[PDB]
Amino acid sequence: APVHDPDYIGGIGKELIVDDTSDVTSFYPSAFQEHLNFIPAPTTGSGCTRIPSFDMSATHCYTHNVIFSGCRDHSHSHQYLALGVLRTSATGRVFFSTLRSINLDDTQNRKSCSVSATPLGCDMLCSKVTETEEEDYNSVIPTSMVHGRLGFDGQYHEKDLDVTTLFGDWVANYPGVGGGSFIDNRVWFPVYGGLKPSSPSDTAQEGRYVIYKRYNDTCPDEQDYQIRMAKSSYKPGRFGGKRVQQAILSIKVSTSLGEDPVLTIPPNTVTLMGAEGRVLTVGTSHFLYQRGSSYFSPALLYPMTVNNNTATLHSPYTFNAFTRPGSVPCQASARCPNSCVTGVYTDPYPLVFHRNHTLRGVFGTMLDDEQARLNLVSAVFDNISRSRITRVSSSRTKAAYTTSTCFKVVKTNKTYCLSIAEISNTLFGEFRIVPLLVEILKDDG
Amino acid sequence: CGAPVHDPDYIGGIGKELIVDDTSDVTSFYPSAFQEHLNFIPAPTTGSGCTRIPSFDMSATHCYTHNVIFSGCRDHSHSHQYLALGVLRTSATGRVFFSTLRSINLDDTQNRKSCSVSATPLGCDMLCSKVTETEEEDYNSVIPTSMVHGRLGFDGQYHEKDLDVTTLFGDWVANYPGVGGGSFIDNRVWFPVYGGLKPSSPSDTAQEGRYVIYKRYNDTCPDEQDYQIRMAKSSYKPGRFGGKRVQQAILSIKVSTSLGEDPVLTIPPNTVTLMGAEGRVLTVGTSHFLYQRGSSYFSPALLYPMTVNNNTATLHSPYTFNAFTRPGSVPCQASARCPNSCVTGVYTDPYPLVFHRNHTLRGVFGTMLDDEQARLNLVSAVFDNISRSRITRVSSSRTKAAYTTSTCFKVVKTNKTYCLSIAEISNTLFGEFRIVPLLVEILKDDG
Amino acid sequence: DVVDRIYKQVALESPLALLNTESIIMNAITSLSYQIN
Amino acid sequence: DVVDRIYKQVALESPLALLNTESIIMNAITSLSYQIN
Amino acid sequence: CGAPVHDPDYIGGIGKELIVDDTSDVTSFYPSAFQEHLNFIPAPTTGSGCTRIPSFDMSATHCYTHNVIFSGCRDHSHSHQYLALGVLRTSATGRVFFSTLRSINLDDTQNRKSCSVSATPLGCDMLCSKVTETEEEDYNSVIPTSMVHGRLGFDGQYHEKDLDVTTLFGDWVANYPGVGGGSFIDNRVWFPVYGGLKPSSPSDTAQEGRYVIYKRYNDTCPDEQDYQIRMAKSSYKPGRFGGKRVQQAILSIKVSTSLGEDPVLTIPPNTVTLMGAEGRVLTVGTSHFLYQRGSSYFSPALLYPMTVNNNTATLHSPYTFNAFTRPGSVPCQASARCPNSCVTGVYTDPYPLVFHRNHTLRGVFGTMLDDEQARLNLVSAVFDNISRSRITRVSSSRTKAAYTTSTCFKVVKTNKTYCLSIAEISNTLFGEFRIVPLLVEILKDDG
Amino acid sequence: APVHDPDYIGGIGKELIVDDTSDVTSFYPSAFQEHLNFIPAPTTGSGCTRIPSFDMSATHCYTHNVIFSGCRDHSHSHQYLALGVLRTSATGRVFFSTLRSINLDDTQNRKSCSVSATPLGCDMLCSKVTETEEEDYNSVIPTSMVHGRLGFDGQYHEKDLDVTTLFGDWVANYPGVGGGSFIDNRVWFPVYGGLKPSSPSDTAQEGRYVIYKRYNDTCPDEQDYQIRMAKSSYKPGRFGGKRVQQAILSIKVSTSLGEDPVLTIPPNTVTLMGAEGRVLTVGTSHFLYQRGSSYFSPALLYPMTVNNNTATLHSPYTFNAFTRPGSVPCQASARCPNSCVTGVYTDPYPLVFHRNHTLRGVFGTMLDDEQARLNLVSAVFDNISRSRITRVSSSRTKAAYTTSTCFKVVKTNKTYCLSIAEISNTLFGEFRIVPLLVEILKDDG
Amino acid sequence: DVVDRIYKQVALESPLALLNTESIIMNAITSLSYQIN
Amino acid sequence: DVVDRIYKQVALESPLALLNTESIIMNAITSLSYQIN
16 A cells, blocks of 8 residues: 655645746756666667556556567567655655566567556556557457556456457557556546448548647648548558547456446547557646657647546647657648658646646657657747757667656655656667656746 | 565575586586566666666575766766665566565765675675775875675665774775675675785785785796796785785674674785785585685686684685686786786676585686676676686677676576676667676586 | 495485475475565 | 494484474464464 | 463473483482462362363463363353463573463353363364263263364464264264363374264274273283183273263364364274273374373273374374372272273373383373372372382372373473473362362482 | 453443442342452462452552462562453453563562552562561561562562661551552552651650540440550550551652652541551542551541642541451450450442442451451441341351452443452362452342 | 494484574574564 | 495584574574564
8 A cells, every 4th residue: 555755745646837927938857867767677688678658646657568589579578567656765865666566477468558557556458469560450350458457465467358349340459558547437548549441430430530730830732632631641551541540448447457448439520640649637637648640740638528438539739849750741840731650659748837727838858850760858848839958868869759747746845757768879778768857947046 | 565585486596506516517507598587776867877886695685786876987976876685586477587675775975985785684784985085096095994884674774884994994095895795604794805005014014925826727827936926926016006915805794783793804814815806705505705806917717715713714725717717908818827916807706506515616607708808798608617618698799898796596496597697788789887687597418 | 234325315315304394494484474464 | 333223213213303393393483473463 | 462482491391302311210200399380270269160171282382271160060061161372481580380371261151061272383272072961961862972173372362163073973972072182293183082982883893893901010810811801892881871882082183274174083993992081192202192091990091102194193002100090999990900891080191201212101200199999199200110209299188189181391491300280189278179280390319 | 551441441440339319238249250260379288379469440450479388487478460451251251361460489578568550550569578577576677668560561670668768767667468559640558567666756646546436336434444545555565565557658650660759657646556458549539448457346448638749548437347357355346445456457449429429338348257257258338237248158268358349341331349358268278369259239120 | 443433423413413403493483473562 | 335434424514504504594584583664
């Protein structure tokens, strides 16, 4: 029955910075703080740690993947799940210390995974796939899926899910790799995949769409041109014409794992091509982040709502200057809608608030580049602008994921943000997940 | 949470003579390729902080400590120190992994620099040395070197007391731990110590006009007998520090609730020991050994058999392993033949595996940096008087190294033998300065 | 005569018999330490 | 003479004293694991 | 409160072969006068309630139980039962005393009557028998006798389960414990059992046409060989109960968290055992014994050496002590020579003291009621094949007795040997029916 | 840190039966109840247990003496002190179980002793005397004295007291063997002895006196006859003319034993020849019982008061029908005052109360006989009458002491009284201390 | 020769050496059980 | 022949294995008495 040190007590799962009088981008990250690292690194030049997932409530939940044979051979892999708490050191130094940990080494392959912090432990939603995507989209059956939890007891239990009846309309199905959220007794996982052509869940998603545009730029393309693309986007070429729809799954947290699954596929009127993403609850406000894998790069956060066991997404917040770099003409600066799949997962943690409770600004680490996945940088962002920053490295640095969660310490009253990133460097090493710690500061004063 | 005792799978497997055969050929035993287990020794959180100088020891509890420096591994003037207490476990699928059940990081201003851990019934004992200045400077000092005896308990709390060094160490200009693990024997912790002596002190003059000369197997020195006897004498006062005698010592503090209790230094005759250097006091089964780093002219790995009297230990003519070398600068290099004055070389643990029923040592395991001069290309293998086994390379790239520390246990349930070999490696794949707990399975030939 | 040869046990059976009574006692002690509440 | 056989109790008597003091401890450690409230 | 372990003063002193000498004369060892220690076994609160039928056993924990009857020790129909868990201690001045750290009294309606305690790792185990009717009646029964296996733990809580007697005991008309302590061996409690057998049952017919005849030392029976063989046969079906075979048994329940686990009865051949009676299964050092009360024609104290197979035990030709007698009614009296049918005699424990290195039994300690016929004049002494030591009388008055149970330990610190001998005595000084834990120091002659 | 079972909680140290409408002697003892005996019996025909002392507050304190060589040789003896709690059994049966016990076997002789229950343990006041009384009264020095406590820790500590400065006026000094009482942070012990002729404490007690008479009888003796005796009583012949004055000692209960002794010798205007006795606190009311060792047999209880560290006794309650048997003409029925020493210690526990809070009746076991100490019987008594009864034995029975303490169980609401007696019988044995348990009952209904 | 006679230890020193390692281990276990809080 | 002396290690080697497995336990029981919070 673990829980955080008192200094943190009260400042964990709630709204951090509320100012109207403030100027959001006037907040900036401290240079990178030095704490005790909680994320295991590799024991070998063979195995590599990848695809991190993080969530925190009264407990801090973390999981990542260990592939083998130099980050190849999906066929096999382990999975790491840690359950932990935020502590202050004797000198008051912030550090994360995991109180309970389990590494899944069995022959089965959990591939994508996402963790959530629930009162009963760290819940996890993974998929068991022995094959590549491209083949999985030619699959005549939906993807196998598991739900499991690491109890405070330290014992770990997992219930497999019935993917045929639940997912029947889908050719492939995956967790979003992001964080899962505990809302109204349900664990809410980001999910995605693709679904059978001419299926109840398919047709319902045809003739429904949304086209988002950027701040100062406006697309040259005709609407009979544009609309025909944004149309062409939801069933991108790379994967053969099958439609890829975003989704959210909701299970009940109980001593019985895999209880009462309800899958909510929103309308594509409000939502773009399904990608990886996280679900967040800050205070009373819930959101789904979606990877920029489609034509639109800028950071995406959808305010979401609970209707009983179901869910509905509303008009998403847009953040420019926070951009997944992409292939053309989907790249970081793209104004116009097009069909593509490329991009990267970057967590935009909501930060600055109006008393309105709408969202002034968010903080996360992005990849600064037009096309390639390179040069990770941390900062806070505005509907338009970006703050001063802290670069992860001054040398060439390759990235895959950055997932951020921010918390404040009460007793001292200083705000810090954890942004977990998957980096490839000369100093850090090749495939390495680094729990970067940062503090927030007003500019003048 | 969790119980500070190795999973029963290990009961009977930790801390004993592992492989015992007279007839079999030691070097036919050999390491598997590198295994993948769950990793304990933590890496840094930034591109500044760097982990280094590791120390490890294990009994019923596994103790690990490593230093965390900053500003790109510069500015000694500050650092933290990480001490972890842990257990050897087997997974649900039977996989070996080291899980550390208790840890404390020391962030206070004070700098403990060279530090070594030992596994004692009461916790993890540690012997560090608080030094704000440079080794070169320190040897010019008019005072000894502050030294702490700390411990981490199973209650997860840390304590320590500063040894009174003006008496215990009063004859020394500089006093450091061996960075290699300590060992619990006869109700006391026993740590490696080394440093310089105040010229013409009691403990300095006791050591004058004495020395030891060790020669290699198929190789004999051209140098004139008298020549060597002279240069071999000068080996103990390397020109680096001005020629204060740099001597190997061992300190034994009584392990008890009150730290730093009744410390007694052991300063062996240099008719046995070489020029003092880093090292480890270890026990396998019923016998204890001191490892000395190759910092002097002598290339081959050494274990001086150690016997303990009361508060004092005695050292006997050392074991030697000829294919097991440190690299060194000339004419101290890996191929070094004759005696000489120098300070160079690297810390590589020769953990004993194959034993005679004679209870005499046949062969050892360790990761040696294989190269003549620089410290590069770490490789694990089994070593013997003359020869080394088939090897496991750590990588195919240029990868430098600082320390490697090896200890071998056995999971009894499966009756398979393993070796943990911890390396401080610097690499493209792993990272700039990174500590990797390399795991290996020991195998035979022809099966 | 034909006696020594049955003493091979003192260096054979006997020590191994100690290693057992150790291993089991240790297993006992081990489980017991698992009592941390 | 005759001391040959009389010591062969080395494989009879002592291997017991072991087993006996073994069980004494084991029982005493067992009763202990029951003394935790 | 308090820890259920004998003061360290006793470590190495409890439950072993106490005095071992081949050359010395057993009977030259002998009891001191009666010592004064602090008293454990509690006396009654009224002139009605009366304590009786005591049982004792000790390992690392000391277990004692005695029955509390009412209406002047009449009306079996009701009673309580007192089970105490305790430790051997030494005072500040070094005085020996038994302090009982945990006790429970059983006041529920149910009557456990004949009961015996054993010391097991998990607590004090007890085997009682729930009987509302008379022994004479019970032997006329068409059903077995309800039997409980209870235990008191170190958590001071009591539990029990009724053995299923229609199967286990199905061949018996009446089934009782020996009132003498049980013993823990090979991960099981082993209790003495005795009673009648259903005529012509499987276990009855197995015992027909068989018997044992034991004769005394300097004394030989006049009776014709055939005569004896006949009367010796009839000894097993005493006229008291109508001639159902009254047989000695031992039951072993597995000691575990769940009581009454896997019980297995041992019903030895009557070529070894006499007509069944009260008794105790005891272990001293590496060997185990069964005591049988003298209830048949045989006067001298008996210990059948007991060896345990798996769930079954086997009995070998009994030890005998000729100067150690029960009194008995004729022609069963203390001086009894030949075989005969009868039920008489008394329970007196022969606790083994002097041993051969042969590991064979020389002499024993116990309090015998010294008299031919009635049960009177208890006296403690050391006994031997032929002879008894100098004695310690319990009193100079006419004092009757029911049970005496003796076990001998040694305080190792002082290296002095003691014997606890518990007696149910009836006296002017002590009281009507009173249980007195008599303590004695064992001494030598000529020192 | 022990304490009683809840069923007793609330009913321990407080007033038991309050009725004006009632008739006191209409209450009677149940026959003798059967519980689990807490008082150790002898291990031998040599040693004998004698001189019991009992007290209870939140803890139950008991101590007695073990003499040797067939109840002879004062020279040596042990002392037993038990610390315990009142428990209910599973079937609800009342029993006393001592949770902490210590037997003092050392060469020193604590002779008379009295125990009190204090928040810090069981406090005890004994004397160390190696000689008989008759010789102790020829003593040129006061009697050595000890104060000690059995902690809940089980550890026992004892501080000797300075008898010369404290007791200087006394030739001999002893604890009253009764119970000690905890009042206003002081342990209050009954004490007695005799004091040096012509001493500050002596002369003050000359010319001061009290003469008590019985209910229906009035002495024939002249006052110039009587007054001259009651005079002659305080310095009885047996002991050589030395005056024997009752007394009470008060020590502070603290981690430091033997702290701040203050000895209070009351005036003999209010008090008779000093004897053994107990000090009791029931609810808010305090009392000193005094043995009937002098000319006046009937049960004696003095209401006492605390002035800081000092004490003052008031007019004592009288109970007829409760009579220490005595030698002539001091015997059980004696009307007239005379000088004698004979009698017996019998505890009169206060029971029935007026709302006035004065004392209607008391309960204890007495010895029914004119002269000899024989035939112990339990009952409740009135200023005049006595109840129905329960006899301890129908055979010849010798007694020494009876000390009673009464308590109620709340949960069940039944009142029981423990009367500890020192008996000599054929059934019980020779010198035997038996914790007789009794219940109280209304007569009709 | 002159060898047996130095084996008197196996039945002399040896067993007594077991009794010690028992007694001490037991002392250990004993103290430990004194930990009942 | 020669087996005489070679077993006399009965008074050398094994009396150690005892002392060693002794201390192993003692240390393991000691560390345990430190694990109580």
